[PDB]
Design an enzyme around this catalytic site. Sequence first.
Site, PDB file in Angstrom:
ATOM      1  N   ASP A 285     -19.041  28.101  42.274  1.00  0.00           N
ATOM      2  CA  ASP A 285     -20.288  28.836  42.077  1.00  0.00           C
ATOM      3  C   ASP A 285     -19.911  30.285  41.731  1.00  0.00           C
ATOM      4  OD1 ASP A 285     -23.082  29.589  42.030  1.00  0.00           O
ATOM      5  OD2 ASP A 285     -23.527  28.246  43.706  1.00  0.00           O
ATOM      6  N   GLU A 491     -32.804  31.187  45.810  1.00  0.00           N
ATOM      7  CA  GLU A 491     -31.667  31.411  46.699  1.00  0.00           C
ATOM      8  C   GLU A 491     -32.054  32.293  47.903  1.00  0.00           C
ATOM      9  OE1 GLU A 491     -27.827  31.863  44.350  1.00  0.00           O
ATOM     10  OE2 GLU A 491     -29.181  31.159  42.765  1.00  0.00           O
TER      11      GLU A 491
HETATM   12  O1  LIG Z   1     -26.372  30.713  37.714  1.00  0.00           O
HETATM   13  C1  LIG Z   1     -25.101  30.134  37.977  1.00  0.00           C
HETATM   14  C2  LIG Z   1     -25.052  29.678  39.439  1.00  0.00           C
HETATM   15  C3  LIG Z   1     -25.973  28.472  39.730  1.00  0.00           C
HETATM   16  O2  LIG Z   1     -25.619  27.347  38.923  1.00  0.00           O
HETATM   17  C4  LIG Z   1     -25.935  28.057  41.219  1.00  0.00           C
HETATM   18  O3  LIG Z   1     -26.779  26.911  41.431  1.00  0.00           O
HETATM   19  C5  LIG Z   1     -26.425  29.171  42.145  1.00  0.00           C
HETATM   20  O4  LIG Z   1     -25.932  29.030  43.482  1.00  0.00           O
HETATM   21  C6  LIG Z   1     -26.032  30.497  41.617  1.00  0.00           C
HETATM   22  N1  LIG Z   1     -26.227  31.659  42.214  1.00  0.00           N
HETATM   23  C7  LIG Z   1     -25.745  32.623  41.364  1.00  0.00           C
HETATM   24  C8  LIG Z   1     -25.695  34.110  41.543  1.00  0.00           C
HETATM   25  N2  LIG Z   1     -25.228  34.401  42.894  1.00  0.00           N
HETATM   26  C9  LIG Z   1     -24.786  35.749  43.218  1.00  0.00           C
HETATM   27  C10 LIG Z   1     -23.647  35.936  44.008  1.00  0.00           C
HETATM   28  C11 LIG Z   1     -23.217  37.226  44.310  1.00  0.00           C
HETATM   29  C12 LIG Z   1     -23.937  38.324  43.831  1.00  0.00           C
HETATM   30  C13 LIG Z   1     -25.074  38.143  43.039  1.00  0.00           C
HETATM   31  C14 LIG Z   1     -25.496  36.849  42.729  1.00  0.00           C
HETATM   32  C15 LIG Z   1     -25.247  32.080  40.225  1.00  0.00           C
HETATM   33  N3  LIG Z   1     -25.448  30.713  40.435  1.00  0.00           N
END
Ligand SMILES: OC[C@@H]1[C@@H](O)[C@H](O)[C@@H](O)c2nc(CNc3ccccc3)cn21
Length: 602
Positions: A285, A491
Amino acid sequence: DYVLYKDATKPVEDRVADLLGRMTLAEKIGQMTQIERLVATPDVLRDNFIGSLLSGGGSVPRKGATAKEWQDMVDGFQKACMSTRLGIPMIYGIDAVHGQNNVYGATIFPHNVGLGATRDPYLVKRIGEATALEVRATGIQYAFAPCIAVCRDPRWGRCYESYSEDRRIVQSMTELIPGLQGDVPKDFTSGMPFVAGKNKVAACAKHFVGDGGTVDGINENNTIINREGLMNIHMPAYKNAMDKGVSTVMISYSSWNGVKMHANQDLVTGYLKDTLKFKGFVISDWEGIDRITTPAGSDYSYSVKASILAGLDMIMVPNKYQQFISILTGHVNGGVIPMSRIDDAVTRILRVKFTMGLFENPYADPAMAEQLGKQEHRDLAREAARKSLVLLKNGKTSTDAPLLPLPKKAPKILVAGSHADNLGYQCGGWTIEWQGDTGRTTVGTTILEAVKAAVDPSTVVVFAENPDAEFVKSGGFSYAIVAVGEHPYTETKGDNLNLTIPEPGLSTVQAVCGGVRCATVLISGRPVVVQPLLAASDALVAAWLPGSEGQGVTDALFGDFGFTGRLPRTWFKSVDQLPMNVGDAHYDPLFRLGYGLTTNAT
Ligand SMILES: OC[C@@H]1[C@@H](O)[C@H](O)[C@@H](O)c2nc(CNc3ccccc3)cn21
Ligand SMILES: *[C@@H]1O[C@H](CO)[C@@H](O[C@@H]2O[C@H](CO)[C@@H](O[C@@H]3O[C@H](CO[C@H]4O[C@H](CO)[C@@H](O)[C@H](O)[C@@H]4O[C@@H]4O[C@H](CO)[C@@H](O)[C@H](O)[C@H]4NC(C)=O)[C@@H](O)[C@H](O)[C@@H]3O[C@@H]3OC[C@@H](O)[C@H](O)[C@H]3O)[C@H](O)[C@H]2NC(C)=O)[C@H](O[C@@H]2O[C@@H](C)[C@@H](O)[C@@H](O)[C@@H]2O)[C@H]1NC(C)=O
Ligand SMILES: *[C@@H]1O[C@H](CO)[C@@H](O[C@@H]2O[C@H](CO)[C@@H](O[C@@H]3O[C@H](CO)[C@@H](O)[C@H](O)[C@@H]3O[C@@H]3OC[C@@H](O)[C@H](O)[C@H]3O)[C@H](O)[C@H]2NC(C)=O)[C@H](O[C@@H]2O[C@@H](C)[C@@H](O)[C@@H](O)[C@@H]2O)[C@H]1NC(C)=O
Ligand SMILES: *[C@@H]1O[C@H](CO)[C@@H](O[C@@H]2O[C@H](CO)[C@@H](O[C@@H]3O[C@H](CO)[C@@H](O)[C@H](O)[C@@H]3O)[C@H](O)[C@H]2NC(C)=O)[C@H](O)[C@H]1NC(C)=O
């Protein structure tokens, strides 16, 4: 020399072996690297031998971009990748999780929880088929779907992305996979990847494993359960995914009994790869490896070492590719990560690329642009929205006339509520923006627009977003349709310990229903505190997050079709009961899983 990997007539495994044997370490590690389009340039893609790109939620070439604009963007990136020494095409991924949802004008299907309510796996297969076409319309070859989480606590911000708290329903809905990818051949070995060709997309079973089992539904948190429970609740749908040739698997941010999934060799290598015989590629992820540590990103060297050794194949970096590549190269140069591990990861990435036909069709098909938002696909979304609706109450008391279906001909009717004329709200998260948005964010039909499209020409339709009691009582209305519920979330932003809808919501329902007979349409990603809404309402419908096709709601309200949806989740009496799932020793639901009232078509 004859170059075997370039020969389309040759077996996949032969092409994979031939290409791999020609690659430098830089070319190999490049394949393992997935970057955001936001940090991509032709020089970056070429110089770093990049294997994959993605658009995260809201990562788009322009606001309101056409399908052709998407194709041109993807082809520009592809041209750079194809210009490398070996000319290995990149694969472009996106969250097409309820249609091609980042894209303006794309058909938006109901979210998973509503699909679970339909109990119709063939419907979901057809949604996969339509979604593949709309994704390919934009030149993209890879969808990060299905989420096969089994949400065990609705306080989780991703409960709407889960088909059901019942793993059996989740297993049934894995039919999305052959919809997206195409049906596997009769002679198919479970765990092999499959994509039929250029009109289909690679799929992704996510998030491995137990993402829906976290304590108090805290997103990305700890799933505390014994192996038996893990294997009987959270794992089963992954086996179904294997049987259907899912091309990729994404690892969960969550932990299992305190061990980060992104660092779990026993489950990723020992179980997924070695027991389930998964032969596609495993992807992290987003900054998933960073989040192995506390604080996140505080030892990226360790993150790379832990995740690659655990058995991950492709890293969704997605921004700091130079650091990722540098660290991984260093670990290999230093003997800390063996070449066999790199070779395994690349073998898997190439296997999926060759299998899906990427080397034969690396560029977009301009003839596919017209698939985006096709009326046939909207008709499918409309069918799905209608089938997802769960009728919870139909008549204020047991002796009352049934309110639904409502008559299409009446002198004057009221449509009311914050969710009656708000396309963004009826779509929820992962729609145009990562977190979703408010208002007319794409092409669609709101509940108000659907009502106006349904009723007899003689019926006067009045819209008031938040009318006061006197307005309703003195309005000369025959009935009202009032729509309220949750705002869009995705999320962690969706994690919610109280699960009561924002106001004005209940106040509007009380004001409207106090003045005239009312059908309340509840828009939510999950069960929410509902007794007060029930008490005020003559009829109440759980519509979940039905997507762009608001006419699915009115199709049932006005009796063109009967209500058939059944709860895919337990509806609790209060949040202090949670978690509470079917089969629990203490099971005291307001409405049990499987509950749903019916009507007949007029
Ligand atoms: O969008 C790509 C992936 C998605 O496929 C996953 O299902 C989901 O868990 C997912 N969450 C994020 C962004 N998460 C994030 C982590 C750290 C800082 C900011 C955003 C990206 N993604
Ligand atoms: C039960 O728990 C819920 C989740 O924990 C909680 O909801 C959250 O409330 C917090 C406030 O403490 C919200 O954070 C703030 O959000 C502000 C803007 O919020 C609006 O826009 C966002 C999208 O950007 C929507 O998600 C929100 O629902 C809200 O929408 C607006 O709501 C109005 C009232 O209904 C509407 O009239 C209006 O039209 C509508 N607008 C839109 C665009 O849709 C920010 O300005 C704040 O800065 C703050 O953001 C947080 O800042 C801290 C940071 O750490 C966070 O990352 C950041 O989010 C939060 O948005 C919200 N979560 C949701 C709804 O998903 C419940 O609170 C109740 O409802 C909310 C809407 C408020 O009215 C609260 O006063 C109310 O208590 C909790 N309920 C109870 C009973 O306690
Ligand atoms: C008035 O409404 C009622 C209640 O909805 C209608 O009865 C229902 O009709 C459904 C469709 O025929 C039945 O669903 C089927 O059930 C069988 C046996 O379990 C199953 O093999 C089928 O696959 C189907 O099950 C659905 O599959 C698709 C899923 O998405 C969905 O969740 C499943 O339900 C349903 O059981 C039945 N309910 C009851 C309590 O009888 C009724 O429809 C009329 O009667 C039925 C029995 C059938 O003969 C219909 O052809 C007939 O129209 C409806 N009345 C009228 C006149 O429209
Ligand atoms: C499951 O969720 C809980 C609750 O969020 C997590 O515990 C929390 O861990 C974070 C760090 O990851 C702690 O926050 C940090 O606090 C320090 C100060 O000591 C500060 O320097 C940091 O900036 C940050 O704010 C937090 O204290 C802690 N909360 C509680 C209630 O214990 C837990 O780690 C999660 N478990 C898993 C497996 O993800």
